[PDB]
Symmetry: T
Subunit: 165 residues, 12 copies
Amino acid sequence: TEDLKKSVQALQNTLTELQALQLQTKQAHWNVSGTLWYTLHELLQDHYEGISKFADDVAERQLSVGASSDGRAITIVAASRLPEIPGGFLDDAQVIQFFTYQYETVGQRIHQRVGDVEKVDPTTANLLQEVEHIIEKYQWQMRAFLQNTPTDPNTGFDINNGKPV
Amino acid sequence: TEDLKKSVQALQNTLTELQALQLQTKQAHWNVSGTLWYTLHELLQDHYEGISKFADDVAERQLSVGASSDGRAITIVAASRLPEIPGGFLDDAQVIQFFTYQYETVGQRIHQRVGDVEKVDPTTANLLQEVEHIIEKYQWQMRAFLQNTPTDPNTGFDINNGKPV
Amino acid sequence: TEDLKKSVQALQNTLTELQALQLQTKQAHWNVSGTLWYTLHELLQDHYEGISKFADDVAERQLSVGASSDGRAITIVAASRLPEIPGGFLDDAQVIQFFTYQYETVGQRIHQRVGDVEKVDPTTANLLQEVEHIIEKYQWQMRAFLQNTPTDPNTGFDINNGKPV
Amino acid sequence: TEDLKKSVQALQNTLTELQALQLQTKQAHWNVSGTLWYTLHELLQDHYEGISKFADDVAERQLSVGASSDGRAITIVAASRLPEIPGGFLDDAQVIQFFTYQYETVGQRIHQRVGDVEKVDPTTANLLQEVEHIIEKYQWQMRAFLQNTPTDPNTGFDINNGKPV
Amino acid sequence: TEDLKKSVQALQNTLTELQALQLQTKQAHWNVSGTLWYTLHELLQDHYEGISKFADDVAERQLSVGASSDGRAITIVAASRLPEIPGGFLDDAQVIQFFTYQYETVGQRIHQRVGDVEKVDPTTANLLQEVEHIIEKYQWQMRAFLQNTPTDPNTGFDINNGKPV
Amino acid sequence: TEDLKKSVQALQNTLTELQALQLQTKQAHWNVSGTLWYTLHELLQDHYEGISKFADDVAERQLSVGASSDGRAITIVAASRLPEIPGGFLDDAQVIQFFTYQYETVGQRIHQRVGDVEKVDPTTANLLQEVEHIIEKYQWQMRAFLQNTPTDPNTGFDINNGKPV
Amino acid sequence: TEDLKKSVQALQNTLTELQALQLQTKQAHWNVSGTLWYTLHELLQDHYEGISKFADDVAERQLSVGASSDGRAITIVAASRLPEIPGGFLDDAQVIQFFTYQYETVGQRIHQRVGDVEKVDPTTANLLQEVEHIIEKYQWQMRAFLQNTPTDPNTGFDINNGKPV
Amino acid sequence: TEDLKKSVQALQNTLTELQALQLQTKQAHWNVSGTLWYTLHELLQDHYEGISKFADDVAERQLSVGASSDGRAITIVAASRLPEIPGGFLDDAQVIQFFTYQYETVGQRIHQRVGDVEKVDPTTANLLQEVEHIIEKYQWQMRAFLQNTPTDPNTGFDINNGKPV
Amino acid sequence: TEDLKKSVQALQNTLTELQALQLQTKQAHWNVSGTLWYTLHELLQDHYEGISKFADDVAERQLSVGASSDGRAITIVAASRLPEIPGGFLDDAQVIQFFTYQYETVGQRIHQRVGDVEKVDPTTANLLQEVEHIIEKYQWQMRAFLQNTPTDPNTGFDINNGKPV
Amino acid sequence: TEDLKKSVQALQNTLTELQALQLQTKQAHWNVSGTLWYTLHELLQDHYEGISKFADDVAERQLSVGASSDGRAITIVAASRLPEIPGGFLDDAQVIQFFTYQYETVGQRIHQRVGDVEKVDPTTANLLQEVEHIIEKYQWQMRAFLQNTPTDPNTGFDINNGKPV
Amino acid sequence: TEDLKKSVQALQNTLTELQALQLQTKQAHWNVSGTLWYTLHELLQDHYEGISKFADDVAERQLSVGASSDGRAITIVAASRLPEIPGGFLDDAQVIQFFTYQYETVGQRIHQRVGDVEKVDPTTANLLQEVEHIIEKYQWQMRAFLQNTPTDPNTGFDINNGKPV
Amino acid sequence: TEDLKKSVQALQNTLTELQALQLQTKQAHWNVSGTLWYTLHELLQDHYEGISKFADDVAERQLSVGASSDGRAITIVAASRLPEIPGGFLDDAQVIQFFTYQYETVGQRIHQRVGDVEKVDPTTANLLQEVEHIIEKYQWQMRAFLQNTPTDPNTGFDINNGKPV
Ligand SMILES: [Fe+3]
Ligand SMILES: [Fe+3]
Ligand SMILES: [Fe+3]
Ligand SMILES: [Fe+3]
Ligand SMILES: [Mg+2]
Ligand SMILES: [Mg+2]
Ligand SMILES: [Mg+2]
Ligand SMILES: [Mg+2]
Ligand SMILES: [Mg+2]
Ligand SMILES: [Mg+2]
Ligand SMILES: [Mg+2]
Ligand SMILES: [Mg+2]
Ligand SMILES: [Mg+2]
Ligand SMILES: [Mg+2]
Ligand SMILES: [Mg+2]
Ligand SMILES: [Mg+2]
């Protein structure tokens, strides 16, 4: 059960982070504003859908290894380790900055969990690799808005009132 | 027939406004230009499709209460009460400003019609509520491009040659 | 630009005629009455859909050759050259007669445009050929209701109060 | 429970009428004969399908407000208030006349129920408005076969052996 | 092989009749004219499709019992036993009369084949029963246009220039 | 016409029984209650759909052999020969018992009709065999809830308040 | 803005309740156990999907009336007014009891909101009626497992270790 | 009408050739035998479907220019100009050789018709170009089985009993 | 029960044979090798799917007549009466020869069962006819690879190392 | 080839176990009886489909590493290592107990194979991880019926004649 | 063969240009960066798909006129006549400028080919017209981002670090 | 960045190889000739589609780890390490031999990359395992045409002018 504990911990911690991202992507989807609001509205709906699918797969995997899955709102608030997204109307450049950082740090933690459970539970490890893959992709998709090129640093001045993001 | 007249008037006036919006969204869809042209191209196609569906439902409702439906081009021009959209290539910021105002004022007039016919014809009133719902949504979707946030007033300078929209 | 002018003129004039037909087929779709009303209701919806698709392709082609597309209601009314359809409840035999004549004359004008632009702009000419094809088909479909046969002149007396159409 | 009684009564009475219409449209669908038999065959199948969907929604709403739904054949026969459709081969003009009258009178009774329950049960009232909408549409679709126009009274002589319907 | 001969004969004769009907329904589909032309256009396309499916099943069954299938144009012309449909524009009432008679007589012959092969080849007999079912249905659908009712003999005068069909 | 009478009788009697089952499965679908209510809700919807399809095929076959189809509510009540299902909330074990008996007895009567018409009308007989097949399947699906096994008599005590069904 | 405040309050309070239900139905979906676990697993997935669709529509409506939507996890926890669902493996009878009570009380509060906003904002009121409709349906679907019938009180003893629920 | 005659002749002659190919591809589809029988079975079904679609378009075009379409079996036999395919079981190499020649010669004749009608009827000419395109593609697909390569002359010895095709 | 025994025996024996064919077609699907391996791979997948559907229908029919269905692996091995397919890589010509013989002999036995049960159980007999139909079709599809034609005996030398199959 | 042997052994042993499960889930699907029979009928069909997909992927992987796949019925019987499921009508509680144990032990053996081949053949190991994932999920779905909760031990007494499973 | 040479040359040269565009649109799809990166990501995927479809049609046409198609990577590099797209992260404004120029010049060359082959090979000419149509459309879609309007020159300063593109 | 370098190198090298295979499978798809040309045409289209999907996933993964993706034609030619496929008409046996060797050697190199990056980047390693899986499958599908069996060495003499491949 010291092996089982490892898997359960890794899965539970991943479920909570995805659920936090679920709620944040949807909040941003509705509240985003500015030049890129519609672009981000659509992109975040796609992210919401991929995150939602993996939140299901994670919980199902917990049940599959014989553990109860804790997907409750209180647990999402409690088992934070991650900033809440601001309320109110959200600027496009603020959404981009927010998820660039959130996806990067969630991807990092899943990366570590993969190594922690590979030896005891390669099937769980394998699911977590798939989650890490989608989260790093979503990180790229947010990163790309401000990605430096030979011809243009893309500082975001145009989407952030003349100021670099 | 003083009750029937109310319903017919409310439906006819709504049909004409939707038909005007049909033609304007499609014109903007083809002619829009600038940084947001493709974004608006796609968004306006979706608006065109929701407006078209409600233009059908309105006409069908007219026939259902026993009145002929006037959907002719001459009637659209005649029964204006609404600015025509400019010809030529249209700037993205001009499209945004145009529909922000058009959807708001069309939504306002449908809002009034709902109250005018609720008592005599709640079924008609109910259709008009659905039309008001979609038009106010589309108003939001245009509004959002220039919506003020704590971090960025989103003046549209970036989509309007350095000038606030 | 004397070559470009030819193409733009042919496309614009075609767009306006299709848009006029769009509005007329839909008006007839809702208002048609009599023995054939449901038959025509369905047939005209199909015609509306094929005309609508070609109104899109025409406008897109205008943009593709570098010209703005004028699809506004005022332009439809202005750039007539074609009778408006009557308001009110419409008899089945009157719808049949109306579109038999409208499709024939629209097809004739597109036929001429094809020849006018084939040499400068065969790609545009080719689109216009496709439009002419659908309009002549729709002409047949209306014509067929009153088409003379060895066994029956099909005068339309049965759909026109005992009188030949 | 004097409020609950109102809702249950309105829903039950609506369910029975839709079920009666279900059976009558299908009977007519199979047995209709004459020039318009195939037209009516198809139209009545569509009406059957929309009525069937609303018969489901009505029963479900009854269960939702906590009442049993009575959809039995005996109840349909008992809780008449509406003519049965004749057996045997049915003429097209007789089908048209029959449903023109049946849909009009069913629509009228649902109209009244909407007002009776709006104050206590706006959610039920709202469903009944949707049912009234479809029934009035179907009334139009039957009415249209004999609708008077400037050019043709459409007496139905052609579908009724030379006699006005 | 006296048993095999029976099956092959029944299948081949059925294939040829269906192929003849294939070509005739399609010819009528294109050439039909008058008040019912569009109604018949659509109905005959559906008949064409059901006949085509059974022409495939019949040929496949021939191959399945180990015999070559003769579906050639010369065989259709040769192995007539059935009137050709007239060329030229065809009146709606003439199409109705033609298929009423053709489907009835084809159904009759398949009926006989079923009995001829039931004992040796119930699987073939069973396919032929399915073909007989569709052909008798199509016979009804043509018959229904002129079916006598208590209120209207439906003589077809309205679709046949004032003359009973 | 002594042969035709046999077919018409067999088809009509089958149509009425299916229509009775249509109404009863739907009533049970809405009103069923207890541990198995949702299971039965879904199962009975599937049964409703298969019965409905065969009620269509039966009526169509009646028309195909040249007879009017009697699908009216009065005929369903009249041409009983079968218990009505109780009104009110229905227990799961009562639904199971009811359809176990109804499907068995309907299947038995169709079995007899098949033999009665095989010689005159094998195509009709064949349709009735398909109806008998689905009804016997549905009988199994209800039977299975209380089917005796080596390890458990399945008396239904658990779904019937501690009492064997 | 005293009218706008009413609408915003009603919508926001509804959004939060649906989001709470979203998380609870999914938790129950994964963790439910016992005889009815699979039945409830499937049923709760359907409820999750209908609630999710309405959580989207509510937020969109908030944006449409010009207000930011607060869908954050902290707000769900804060703006409780509703019990959290227990963690751990959940018994089928406990899930049934939980949602029977939760849906009933959520439906009650939405019922009140409808009346509060009907006069100022009938379009919002109308959305809330649709939400109330689905929540009352889901209440029925949970209620039905323990619904009293003439033949069986359905106490749930069979799904609750021999004890009435 | 000397221009109309040209178009009608070109269309009619094309329709007949496609109809001949329709029947021949299907005959070959059923009767083909040998190593490549299944390959050819599938390929010829695809060819049958593309030819069938163009046989429809050709006939429709005839009607569209105001002429009756002659698609009768007698006309297919009469207006030959093309070999009939042999009856009986057909060898794969014989099918390949047959259609290689038939498609090549049909494509050649359509090529000529295109030039004959381009000036009077570019819309018809354009349809005929599309038919020529598909027929030349199908010619390639048959040709390819015996196409000479640097490493292998592909004489067909393997599919033709050791003899070059 | 002497009648029931007949049906059960015929169904059970058919189920086992189809299950044997299920496993053999799939084995051949994976292991087939040579010039025709891909052709056979695809063809055998289609055969697997049609056989699988009928293995379901047979078992369901057993349950429908009130008997348990024995579909266990031990029963497939036991209730042989049919050669097992060789293990290892399988040559295309060996697959063709194998199924040509297996389908022919399975079809023969089902043919006999049809006659054995027609009188007691025409509904079962009818299912078995459908199974016999598909098995004889599949027999043709294998036979066709080596079918003798006027121009080529198709000995299979090309797919069998220069030797006739 | 000592590395290849490992992979082939792991794949073959997995294929056989999945094929055994294929046949057992389907047998249970048809024969299951009692309160949960329909629930299990549906659940086992889903399990059958996921197992079938993985039986295909496993065999394909064997071929991909260059080995023949042994999927024959004799091999399933021979290469047991697993209990056969009983014949006859099966009780719901017996099905639940059977697969709870079978899936657990199959999952355990695949778990071991993953470790055995990870180093030589990570691609094969990866497929086997996916198989282990689905089998452990299916284990959960069977386990859940008798899963202990704070409020109810779920002994299965209700589905097992008053006795704990 | 001087006519054949013309067609082959025109087709081959077109194939190579489309293949070059295939690779460039996909490269840009992955590497594009900045405010418009996601907009362009999606747009370029659509362009990739339309170009890919025409690269297939062109090659197929080459085979159809009896010539081998050269679609190899070496030929794409060799038969340049067109700039390669830069490696590395690409700015949105650089992608827009690149394809604006590439599509314009590819469209120009196809325009010329159409004239070169119209007389010998109108079917090929016609395909090339369709390719020219899509390429000119894609040119518009890139052009539109910087299209001058009465209210805004759209210099691209906002997407190009404050500098006009 | 010594870890990042490893991943980028492995991904880039894989992307280039897949892109080379993309172009080669499509070239072979169009140009393949002989007895197996159509079989290979279809098979290679499927291979093209699976390779294309993985070329997308690889590039996306490169972007996801923060590196630019080089998918340019020059890079495909440059970063060869693999033979180009010959131009001109290609014999079936030459296509089979070519891809048998190409897929085997590409699969081998991806196998090595998996090991090189597993420790630093298991998510990348995992994608590469999926690519290796599809490439080894495609290798089998080409291998199978010439796979040795107990009854036939399958030398390919029949597809290679009497000579072993
Ligand atoms: Fe509504
Ligand atoms: Fe059948
Ligand atoms: Fe074209
Ligand atoms: Fe994976
Ligand atoms: Mg901003
Ligand atoms: Mg601008
Ligand atoms: Mg009239
Ligand atoms: Mg009549
Ligand atoms: Mg006539
Ligand atoms: Mg009970
Ligand atoms: Mg319990
Ligand atoms: Mg041969
Ligand atoms: Mg061989
Ligand atoms: Mg039990
Ligand atoms: Mg930039
Ligand atoms: Mg060769």
